[PDB]
Amino acid sequence: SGSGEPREEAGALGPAWDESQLRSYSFPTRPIPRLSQSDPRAEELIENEEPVVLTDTNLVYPALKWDLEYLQENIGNGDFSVYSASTHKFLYYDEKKMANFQNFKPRSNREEMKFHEFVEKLQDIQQRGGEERLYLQQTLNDTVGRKIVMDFLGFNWNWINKQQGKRGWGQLTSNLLLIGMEGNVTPAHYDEQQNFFAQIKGYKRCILFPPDQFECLYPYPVHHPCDRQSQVDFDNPDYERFPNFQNVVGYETVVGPGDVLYIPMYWWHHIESLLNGGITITVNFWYKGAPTPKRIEYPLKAHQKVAIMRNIEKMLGEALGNPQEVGPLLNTMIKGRYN
Amino acid sequence: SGSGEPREEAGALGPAWDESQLRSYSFPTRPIPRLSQSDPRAEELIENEEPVVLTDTNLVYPALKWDLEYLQENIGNGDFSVYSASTHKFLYYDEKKMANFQNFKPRSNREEMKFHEFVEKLQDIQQRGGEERLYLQQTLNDTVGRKIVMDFLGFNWNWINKQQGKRGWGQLTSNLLLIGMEGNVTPAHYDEQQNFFAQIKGYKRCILFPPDQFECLYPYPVHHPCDRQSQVDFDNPDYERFPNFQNVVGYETVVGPGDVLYIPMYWWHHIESLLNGGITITVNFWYKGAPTPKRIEYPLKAHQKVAIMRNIEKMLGEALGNPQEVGPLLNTMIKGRYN
Amino acid sequence: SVVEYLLQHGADVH
Amino acid sequence: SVVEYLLQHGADVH
Ligand SMILES: O=C(O)CCC(=O)C(=O)O
Ligand SMILES: O=C(O)CCC(=O)C(=O)O
Ligand SMILES: [Fe+2]
Ligand SMILES: [Fe+2]
């Protein structure tokens, strides 16, 4: 039953958050375990690629002091990717893929700007009362201020690097800094990288689905701009088009300052910043997965079959010389033959 | 409208055959052209892989004298594959594939025997009045009699070899000798080899469908024993399972002694020995197709897409480690995503 | 190569 | 190799 009894902030500052801050959905969820990084059960979950919330890693300890004012004064003046939207849902769009699907138009636009420019617009909406929404999603790089670099260096690289090694994972590919408005939502989708989700400011409700629930979440075609994202509108599920969504079961939890959520590769995750909970700041750690094992075991695992399906779609798209021919060939292949 | 006005046998011996000898089907058919091997229109059809009936090739001229008695006395005593069945339909079965589909049982059994043994059984049924059916399908080889070898050598290798060269086809892989009882039928299927179908004794109605009618003929899954054959019962079409069969359109013709039918690779063909027309004898010439062109043109041709679909099914079957998992993965891939 | 891979075909007959 | 081919995967993220 959900993310459990809201945790109590030390010092008798009351419940960190309350139920009325969570959105309502049609599916059931069990809690993701909250453990100590020293707890062998936590090492057990990660090794077996199952989610777990680590409470005491100190992964981004130096960032826990971060906020708009501090970051504005220390992040530098490089460009920051900022997505805008007229809805609480920030569906991701692959622009390199927007060529294929021509009659296509995003529900959220990307825009570059300096951090102070972002804070301005954030402020502009606030003091007037607008309905526009903004979500800053920018990779951390060479152009950040001196202090930010100091904080970054303070991250618990000893612990995470050891995690990287123990899992045989590839290299750290990036750290995405995410600053969003309360109520914002990143629709269900899966990533092809292992993720250590480090919460810094505010709270986020994280709903995860195992890879084996692929048939209940209906991802868009691989060549579509929204590849890897679910086509189901969690707020108004179309059970005629997506029958098996009625069978979807999730794992959820609410992360706050100091928590690190392990989002295993290929696991679906729906992420929302609690309603009326203020802005949120997160920093993730994306690592390329381990290489394919020298010996395959049968039957294959769910994430592997997902890998196979993705490949089939890619091969057909390239072979047919046109992505729009993938669907028809696929249907011709199964109709009256495999269904 | 069908195989046209029955041809008249030279010498005023009347119509070679009549309509009441043809079985009735639910679909329409246009006539395959009957031309002279010298007719450039015939060379045009073959080059463009479209069927054509050649009337004067003399391909198997020496065999036109063949019949059971002559062959029994001259074919030798090697073993001859003979398929038996309780129905006029002789569905082909790949035995190497019968391992996969376990709860499977053939509608026709194979049996080895000497030619004289075959003639005996053919005779046994005749003089009593039985309902059993036999179809001899045996590859021509090293163990045939001296006279048979003389006939074989008399084949018009000059003409066909030149055909092999002009089309860039691969090697001649075999010559299947087919002796069947009147009324026998080889259900619709396609072959992965170019074929020169040489009629020798009796008449055969040949119904062909272009590769682009794949979606109307519903072939069994590639790993199934009846791979490449249509699942539709031409005598009692299941329009609930095979809706698009209602859209199938064929090309037909009736071949007799001396005719050579070019069955282009991947073209579906339904072949029946006319009812009450006596036994039939045919000898085909199977050639590996030309190699894939150095430059692909888009969009692909129907037979190429058929090649792609077959491969996808093979890859998935081997990748999933079990052929029975192909269907489920395929359905999971398209349901709510591509259909 | 992928197309060439997917275009290759066997030589199955009856 | 075919399985290995079909098991390979990209590294796409948001
Ligand atoms: O925090 C969010 O809104 C999205 C995070 C995410 O999708 C990821 O880290 O993979
Ligand atoms: O003649 C028959 O019954 C079958 C011939 C055939 O299927 C072929 O030559 O490919
Ligand atoms: Fe993600
Ligand atoms: Fe055939």
Short mmCIF file of N, CA and C and ligand atoms in Angstrom, two decimals, chain A residues 135 178 186 189 191 195 197 204 269 271 284 286, ligand 1:
data_model
loop_
_atom_site.label_atom_id
_atom_site.label_comp_id
_atom_site.label_asym_id
_atom_site.label_seq_id
_atom_site.Cartn_x
_atom_site.Cartn_y
_atom_site.Cartn_z
N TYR A 135 10.84 22.89 -16.37
CA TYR A 135 11.62 21.80 -15.81
C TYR A 135 13.05 21.93 -16.32
N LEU A 178 18.31 18.15 -12.19
CA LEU A 178 16.91 18.35 -12.48
C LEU A 178 16.22 19.23 -11.44
N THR A 186 7.26 13.34 -14.77
CA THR A 186 7.99 12.76 -15.89
C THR A 186 7.26 11.42 -16.06
N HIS A 189 8.57 5.65 -18.22
CA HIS A 189 9.48 5.32 -19.32
C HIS A 189 10.60 4.49 -18.74
N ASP A 191 14.98 3.54 -19.05
CA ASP A 191 16.24 4.03 -19.59
C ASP A 191 17.18 2.86 -19.82
N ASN A 195 20.90 3.61 -13.00
CA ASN A 195 20.76 4.95 -12.42
C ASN A 195 20.76 5.05 -10.89
N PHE A 197 19.73 7.69 -8.47
CA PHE A 197 18.91 8.89 -8.37
C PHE A 197 19.11 9.57 -7.01
N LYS A 204 10.07 13.67 -4.06
CA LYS A 204 9.60 13.10 -5.31
C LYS A 204 9.05 11.71 -5.08
N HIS A 269 9.84 3.91 -14.80
CA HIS A 269 9.71 4.76 -13.65
C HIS A 269 8.92 5.98 -14.02
N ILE A 271 7.96 9.59 -12.34
CA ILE A 271 8.49 10.46 -11.28
C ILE A 271 7.76 11.81 -11.20
N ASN A 284 21.12 12.79 -10.92
CA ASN A 284 21.21 11.35 -11.16
C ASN A 284 22.63 10.99 -11.58
N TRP A 286 24.06 8.31 -14.25
CA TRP A 286 23.82 7.31 -15.29
C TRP A 286 25.08 6.54 -15.70
O1 LIG E 1 13.43 13.12 -12.07
C1 LIG E 1 12.75 13.13 -13.12
O2 LIG E 1 11.72 13.81 -13.32
C2 LIG E 1 13.20 12.20 -14.24
C3 LIG E 1 14.44 11.40 -13.84
C4 LIG E 1 14.71 10.27 -14.83
O3 LIG E 1 13.87 9.97 -15.68
C5 LIG E 1 16.01 9.49 -14.76
O4 LIG E 1 16.87 9.87 -13.93
O5 LIG E 1 16.16 8.53 -15.53
#
